[PDB]
Amino acid sequence: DIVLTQSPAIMSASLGERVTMTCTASSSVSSSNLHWYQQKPGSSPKLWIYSTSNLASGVPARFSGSGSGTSYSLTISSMEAEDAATYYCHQYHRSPYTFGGGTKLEIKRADAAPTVSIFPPSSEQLTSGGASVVCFLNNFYPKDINVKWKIDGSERQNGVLNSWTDQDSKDSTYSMSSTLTLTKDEYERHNSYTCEATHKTSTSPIVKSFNR
Amino acid sequence: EVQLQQSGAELVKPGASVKLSCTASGFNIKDTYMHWVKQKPEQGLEWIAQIDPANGNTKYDPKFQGKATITADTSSNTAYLHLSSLTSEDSAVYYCAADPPYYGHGDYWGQGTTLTVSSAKTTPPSVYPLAPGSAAQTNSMVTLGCLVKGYFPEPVTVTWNSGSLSSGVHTFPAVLQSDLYTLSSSVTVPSSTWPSETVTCNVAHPASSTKVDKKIV
Ligand SMILES: C[N+]1(CCc2ccc(NC(=O)CCCC(=O)O)cc2)CCCCC1
């Protein structure tokens, strides 16, 4: 089991910037049996670089590859938007054939604060016998953000489930959704519901809440 | 077009088994090596087994210790992947891949076959509307949402006013909470198109055959 380690795990490159990522193997492998794949959400991995330094059909000349032994790398002379994806190195030298953990390439843009919006459980939902409080935090950058639920001054940790979207295709921003789900009573049995988002765009947190 | 065609999506119960198929067109599988690779949700890639259709010889990653069985039929130009004692760690996308069949080109990967192993029953999603509370303050623009909760299996289809709103929309990736999925969607429109012009939420569940529209008021 020749283990492949890719560095960095995630990274961002402003347009036109030069990019480089590495792949190191636990033992040496033939440079001819080491390849790189590109994958975008929802479709199959596609051969990007074969035999260490060769480009696959249709791959832009801005990409290159180099190495031998246990150390390899992939490079993009100039970052373009469609380069944004996850790249995996692969050894087809000795079985079991393995893949690296991948390098996710994202687009770097100007920071932008999160547009928060909280919402209370619908009577439709309340009458069903439950209560979910939802809060959206849309179009922001970078991806780093923390969300807290303060149910009557006593932060509620359990019962919360989040979901993040992929880097937006148009503005290259991120978005997140947090959903606090309590029961029928638990919800009306309190009346202070807050969604607090702390993002690097500002020291002062962004808060949103409602009563009853 | 040289291409690898895989069988359809699988929804199996744990303890059961399932056989996936991959048919090559454009080359004979007997002239190359056929493989199966696995990709767990939002995870990485794992090679499972390899087979030489010319002599039936196989290679397996010890981790798929006799749980995976690879076979091939040169007559139908098809490769198979049999998986027994299905558990949830088995849920994933399975790709069959061919080593380059011809000089001058790369390898070939199938479209992928999604396998979901769950004990859950078919359940329709409950759709709830997400609109601002009593008061309101933003000016020029407003954001509305939709909560799709407790459904199985994937997926659900959410659109705002039948594809009318295709900008400023954020439908978040579903989440599994005790065998059931839950997801939510939001959209933003100028306060000039709302609340005068109706903004609708349309969520449809392919499995339970449910089609529900939630009007944001
Ligand atoms: C199916 N594969 C293929 C590995 C592999 C990939 C590429 C090559 N060779 C080439 O891509 C040459 C391409 C020639 C060209 O494009 O000019 C050999 C082995 C091995 C098992 C795991 C999944 C990946």
Brief account:
The complex is a heterodimer of chains A (212) and B (217). Chain A is built from 2 helices and 19 strands.
Q: How are the elements arranged and paired?
A:
The complex is a heterodimer of chains A (212) and B (217).
Chain A (H helix, E strand, L loop, with lengths): L3 E4 L2 E4 L5 E7 L8 E6 L6 E5 L3 E2 L7 E6 L2 E6 L8 E7 L6 E2 L3 E5 L7 E5 L3 H6 L1 E11 L4 E7 L2 E3 L3 E5 L9 E10 H5 L3 E8 L6 E6 L1
Parallel strand pairs in A: 2-11
Antiparallel strand pairs in A: 1-3, 3-8, 4-5, 4-9, 5-6, 7-8, 9-10, 9-11, 12-13, 13-17, 14-15, 14-18, 16-17, 18-19
Chain B lengths: L2 E4 L3 E3 L5 E8 L8 E6 L5 E8 L4 E4 L7 E6 L4 E6 L8 E7 L9 E2 L3 E5 L8 E5 L10 E11 L5 E4 L8 E3 L3 E2 L4 E10 L8 E7 L4 E7 L1
Parallel strand pairs in B: 2-11
Antiparallel strand pairs in B: 1-3, 3-8, 4-5, 4-9, 5-6, 7-8, 9-10, 9-11, 12-13, 13-17, 14-18, 15-17, 16-17, 18-19
N-methyl-N-(para-glutaramidophenyl-ethyl)-piperidinium ion sits at the interface of chains B and A.
PDB class: catalytic antibody
Keywords: catalytic antibody, FAB, ring closure reaction
Assembly: dimeric
